[PDB]
Amino acid sequence: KLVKHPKIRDAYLAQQTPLAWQQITGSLRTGGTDGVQAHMNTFYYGGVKFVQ
């Protein structure tokens, strides 16, 4: 729900930065290993860093 929200979508679509490109068309899996998968979804916004 957070990733799909229009407010984040429009801002990151408009922004021209490697971070913006990676989070829109790239892969969000860049975290550590939780023991079942090599990487966990991570999202940056407003300074906070969310994890699934």
Binding site: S27, R29, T33, G35, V36, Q37, A38, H39
Partner: peptide, 13 residues
């Protein structure tokens, strides 16, 4: 990443 019950870390990409 889930149904592969190899018992080891798996990279789904």
């Amino acid at each position: 990443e889930d149904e592969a019950k190899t018992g080891t870390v798996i990279n789904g990409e």
